[PDB]
Structures are given as C-alpha cells and as structure tokens.
Design a protein around this motif. Sequence first.
Motif, PDB file in Angstrom:
ATOM      1  N   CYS A 140       0.805  -1.217   0.000  1.00 38.83           N
ATOM      2  CA  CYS A 140       0.000   0.000   0.000  1.00 38.83           C
ATOM      3  C   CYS A 140       0.840   1.271   0.000  1.00 38.83           C
ATOM      4  CB  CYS A 140      -0.944   0.004   1.202  1.00 38.83           C
ATOM      5  SG  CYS A 140      -2.195  -1.289   1.133  1.00 38.83           S
ATOM      6  N   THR A 141       0.327   2.302  -0.664  1.00 38.90           N
ATOM      7  CA  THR A 141       1.016   3.582  -0.753  1.00 38.90           C
ATOM      8  C   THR A 141       0.150   4.718  -0.215  1.00 38.90           C
ATOM      9  OG1 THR A 141       0.239   3.866  -3.040  1.00 38.90           O
ATOM     10  CG2 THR A 141       2.411   2.875  -2.722  1.00 38.90           C
ATOM     11  N   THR A 142      -1.153   4.472  -0.116  1.00 37.75           N
ATOM     12  CA  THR A 142      -2.085   5.471   0.396  1.00 37.75           C
ATOM     13  C   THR A 142      -2.820   4.914   1.611  1.00 37.75           C
ATOM     14  OG1 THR A 142      -3.973   4.744  -0.951  1.00 37.75           O
ATOM     15  CG2 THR A 142      -2.445   6.314  -1.948  1.00 37.75           C
ATOM     16  N   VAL A 143      -3.238   5.798   2.512  1.00 36.81           N
ATOM     17  CA  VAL A 143      -3.947   5.374   3.712  1.00 36.81           C
ATOM     18  C   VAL A 143      -5.252   4.673   3.348  1.00 36.81           C
ATOM     19  CG1 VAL A 143      -4.911   6.083   5.913  1.00 36.81           C
ATOM     20  CG2 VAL A 143      -2.987   7.334   4.939  1.00 36.81           C
ATOM     21  N   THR A 144      -5.900   5.145   2.289  1.00 34.13           N
ATOM     22  CA  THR A 144      -7.151   4.548   1.841  1.00 34.13           C
ATOM     23  C   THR A 144      -6.934   3.072   1.526  1.00 34.13           C
ATOM     24  OG1 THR A 144      -8.020   6.619   0.907  1.00 34.13           O
ATOM     25  CG2 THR A 144      -8.939   4.559   0.061  1.00 34.13           C
ATOM     26  N   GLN A 145      -5.859   2.773   0.802  1.00 38.19           N
ATOM     27  CA  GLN A 145      -5.547   1.392   0.448  1.00 38.19           C
ATOM     28  C   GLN A 145      -5.330   0.557   1.698  1.00 38.19           C
ATOM     29  OE1 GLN A 145      -2.033   1.962  -2.147  1.00 38.19           O
ATOM     30  NE2 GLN A 145      -3.347   1.299  -3.844  1.00 38.19           N
ATOM     31  N   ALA A 146      -4.557   1.095   2.636  1.00 39.14           N
ATOM     32  CA  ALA A 146      -4.269   0.390   3.876  1.00 39.14           C
ATOM     33  C   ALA A 146      -5.551   0.044   4.629  1.00 39.14           C
ATOM     34  CB  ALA A 146      -3.351   1.231   4.753  1.00 39.14           C
TER      35      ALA A 146
END
Length: 189
Positions: free
Chosen positions: A38-44
């Motif tokens: 993951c690279t974005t908090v949304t993805q996490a």
Amino acid sequence: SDSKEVPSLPFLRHLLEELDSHEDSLLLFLCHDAAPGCTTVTQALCSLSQQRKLTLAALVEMLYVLQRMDLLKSRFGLSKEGAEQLLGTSFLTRYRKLMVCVGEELDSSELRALRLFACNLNPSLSTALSESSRFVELVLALENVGLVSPSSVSVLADMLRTLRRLDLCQQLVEYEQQEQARYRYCLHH
C-alpha cells in the motif's frame, strides 16, 4: 462476527480528511505488516477491512498513537483514558507503535544524525534515505536490509545511545527484552 466492532469505511475515509501527510505516513507505517504494498492510507484501510482487522480498537489505537485526542472525542466519544483502555487489543504491534512514538520524540537535527549513523553502518542505505526521510522511513530502511526487526532493535538502540538519548535507547532495550521474554516464556501488542 459482531459488526458493531467494525466501523464503516465511509465513516473512515471521512476521518482521514482530518490527517495531514505526516500523519498519513505514520499510519501507513503502523499498517506495514498487515497492508503490504500500500502507498495510500485509503488502500491500507481497505486492506485491513478485507481482513476484518479494522476494528473500533484498531482505529482508537491509531488515533491515540497520533495523539489526536480531538478525533477520539469527536468520532468515538472517548477521552484519553477511555482510549488507553483499548491499547494492545488490536492487530497493531508494540514494535510499530513504539517506533512511531520514538520518532515523535526526536527533532530534525537528531533525526539527521541518526540517518547519518545508519549510512555509516551500512552505506547501501544512502539510496533509501534523504534529508526528507522521516524516522519511520529510517526504521523501514533498516528493516529492509535486516538491521532491525520486530524482535531485534538493538542497532537502533545503539544509534540512540550514540546520540546520547539514553531515554529513547532504554525504551528500545526494554522493548526488546519484553518481546524476548514473551516469546521465550509465553510462546506483542
């Protein structure tokens, strides 16, 4: 399972609009083991949701570690003490939470010194670190070459000792000893 312990994602994405880029980086670091790639908090968060690891407790711990008592109150109606009652009850590990907290106790000059110590120990790290690298990024860089791990942080403790921050060094030494005792005599969060 009890859906009550799982806040809806929409409620979460809205909560994220309250965090800045530094806070986003800290959360991504906290989710490093559970949400790989993951690279974005949304993805996490989506990844944690998929695993049903995105519980009320997890979110409360995240906000506590970020010291966002304002959000704990407005989103969960919890005071600092109410949130402390949930610490250690989610997927989050003491290792990751401790690293975030130690990073927030360091100033830019101390962080710069630490990055330099790391590159002197292993020059290969120079390509993974720059003057903009945060402490959590330094930790990941050390992890990626095998210098530290959730079970071994003595290299970082040594770096902190060299910096003369014996207080931070002690937190790491104590953590390593606690983790070792838990593994050896209990077969942590």
